[model samples]
Target chain A: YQQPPVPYRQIDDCPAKARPQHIFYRRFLGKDGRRDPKCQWKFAVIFWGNDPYGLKKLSQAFQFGGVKAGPVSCLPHPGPDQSPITYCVYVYCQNKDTSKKVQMARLAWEASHPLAGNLQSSIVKFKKPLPLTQP
Target chain B: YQQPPVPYRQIDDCPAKARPQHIFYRRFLGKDGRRDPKCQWKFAVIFWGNDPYGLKKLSQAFQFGGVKAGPVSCLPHPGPDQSPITYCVYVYCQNKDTSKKVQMARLAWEASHPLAGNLQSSIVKFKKPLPLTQP
Candidate 1:
């Protein structure tokens, strides 16, 4: 049987309220069982592919909001045609004390999403190299 | 409270029994209330970063197995320090009939994990461009 096309939408075009917020958090561990006062800056790497459908699939899978075509200055991009078909990567940071703890939690959240078994193979078929502008 | 350093393990180094499987499935929808016989090709994209810590984090986050430093031939890479501090991308495909449903389930699993509020900002600080070799 034929399957219906998966619903697709550009992240930027998604309804304003539904847009995912780009959030930065500071991590801190308490000393002597008390909250630490110092915070450290940490970063996050957000990836979105270029394939119209691919990007939509990623955005939906990650529940990412504030999606826009990207060349986020703070983060590095794979040069020329090396990056994902059409994708963006973003980086952000907060303070030290909060950096560790918050980042750990974030890591935990990410770990729960395994793209290996099925998702990995699917992306390989649409292996069009992105035409990235050089720095 | 004081937290211990997160124990990091390389995907390649992880114990064999615990390594995440690189399972591929073929998706088929029943036609006339029976499973369709034809199969179509689908692909999957697997991402790995170069930052020693960063890669570990991603592997852990995704429960990935067979992790190793990457430049998967069929996949694209951002060129000359444009990619993340360090990262790899891979692609794979299986028959279409099995691709859709299996991939949808994978998407559902990935969606449950959101990296926005916490993870995005952590990796920005160590924004070192990797010295990638040319193709």
Candidate 2:
């Protein structure tokens, strides 16, 4: 059976273009309640960029979380497909703890990327942040 | 093209098994020296396991850095493809700095995984550690 393309990138490699900043981790839940051995460390992560060469850093968005590659996602490309029209983003959260769910009161450049300094933009956040749960 | 199956996984999901410990950083280099905008923060990471539910923690090694999912490698499976015949590993480093290349003086359980506590084993390290360089 043909498996759908895993949109996420792994520790293997990434496009040389996009640069990854940091990930925002939600939380995890299992039948046994975070039964994953690494469940405490298991959280969602989103990247901002990639390697220096123009390759992606590895994995993006939903599937982008840990280096334990075995993942992928819905979007393969990390956007910025256009030159002038498209630009690359370089960061998020800056230096905040993403291990657990936390509400964002504010973010870098007011959470701007590609710094288009324009109105046309997009925001990728949990439509619903993970519910509060901890070890 | 079918995108060769992405050869990776994501936080979006995992395989219900395996565990992601943490990534070991290698290092980065480029024109003007480690010049990726995030170069200062950039480093090659190698993962040991994945999230629960059987999916990779996201990014395995090589391109796995920061939260930036941008790449993948030849090995998409995070090892233990044989299951019980094979066991999953959960980590590479106990307490070390992966931002730069450094020699491992020693390792956990003398570097054993599934901690079979066996004589049969493998070692992944810089046959030659990185040349001394620092900020």
Candidate 3:
């Protein structure tokens, strides 16, 4: 049976509250870890174009490598005349291992889709690593 | 008679396309000057809040000092659980004189609004004068 796609939630802050520069952040080895790390292990996926090639449909393409999907949102004008709109979806990975796997999955998905190149005109850099929690 | 609010439009990019870091940029003394300088003179307004104290109503309060309103958009999660959401609106000022007035209008709007204090937590520092267009 086809399972329903994980429900997407909206993020509270875009660049995040503490670190405005970072695109992603997480809480690792914190007090909440004893129970489960999945709660705060979040990341984002961004794409450019209409909903036809948007995050909703794109989210269905990946396995998340055991990572769960988080929230989803959109920015109408991400760049001038570059695209009509841009979409984003948050992801939650259980631990660091799975999180890295999801990055690979990001590449795989992009490679498989012929239109991926046209959508993301930038380098599509994931950055060094996901920033950790402070306080 | 009360005039209708100048319609709002969405910006194409967040950090912008050519220059990703700057929050504001404009076309200064360009070829389009003969017609009108206001056509491409644009900026953004950002605030943290819900619909009750949102851009729609806030637009009514500002005079724009002769600068007209541009496209409007929102980023649901601008920061971590800081506020419900962040709202933004674009502005079109005819020239440098009125644009500066709008900045003052921004301060005046914030000072007058009782709840404005609680909404924006960080220092509301507007960066140096808006950047100029290259191409």
Candidate 4:
């Protein structure tokens, strides 16, 4: 039977929350002047703690990342996009064990959504880089 | 018939992506010296753009966040946890337009897993935050 993945802890907040000491910057190219008429989430999450590609299990785990690295901040453009942003996104950081990783998270922005009219590009800023201990 | 939420434009990447020019720091209290035998993602995403709770229509929009705000970083603990981190995660950030937001993402440190045994606490460093234009 296929079982849905679930967290493995029973706590309000994680103790490893502070373990992360640094953050990084990731970016994706803009829509290169393309046009369509269908909105599809351009994001996806990956999990590598299970051995999807038989790669090292330490390649996937829970970490940190968000707007300003805190909560989410969504601002809608009035004319084409206008709105506020307040949301929560949580991902099982690291397994911290043999099950290092086996999955990945997907984050995408489709041009089909109404806001696609206002979308310019995408950027990500988060904390905690690799442990710097790998083969 | 129901339509699967999709982007509006068809671009290699999004453009409005850059409109988001700030990162936030969201913190959850560390585990208060509590111990249990189950792992439940202690993290969740919130949406305010899509009339959530009948609020404003500008509280949700697509944003960014990841390890160091870039790719994710997974690590395995030796003995109890030992490995590298490089998985991926993707969540439908926001609708940007009317369907501003009506959902949230779940991130946890399942105590049910092997690492949850070693998990001292958890922390999430995302990029966006609640759009500061809502009433």
Q: Tell me how each candidate scores on DockQ against the true complex.
A: 0.02, 0.02, 0.07, 0.04
Model 1: CA > 4 A from native: A1-135, B1-91, B115-135
| Global fold similarity of model 2 (TM-score) | 0.20
| Tens-digit lDDT track of model 4 for A1-135 | 111122222223223332111111122211211111232112212221111221111111232221011111122221122332222222222222111111111213222223212222122222233222223
For model 1, what is the error of residue B56's alpha carbon versus the real structure, in angstroms, after optimal superposition?
Answer: 7.7
Per-residue lDDT of A1-135 in model 1, one digit per residue for the tens?
111111223535443432332121111122311222231212223342333343333222322211112221111122222333322222211223222333343344345444411111010112222222123
C-alpha DockQ for predicted model 3: 0.07
| Clashes per candidate, residues 3 or more apart or on different chains | 63, 59, 16, 166
Instruction: State each candidate's chain A TM-score.
Output: 0.26, 0.21, 0.40, 0.18
Q: Estimate each model's TM-score.
A: 0.23, 0.20, 0.33, 0.18
Q: Give candidate 2 regions above 4 Å deviation.
A: A1-135, B1-14, B20-42, B45-72, B75-98, B101-112, B115-135
Candidate 1: DockQ? 0.02
The CAPRI quality class of candidate 2 comes to incorrect
For candidate 3 chain A, the 10 contiguous residues with the lowest summed lDDT are A121-130
Q: Which candidate is the best by TM-score?
A: 3
lDDT of 2 by residue, B1-135 (tens): 112112223422322222222222222211212213232231222322222111132222212222222222221222222221121221121112432232221133225345323211122222112111122
Candidate 4 chain B lowest-lDDT run of ten? B50-59
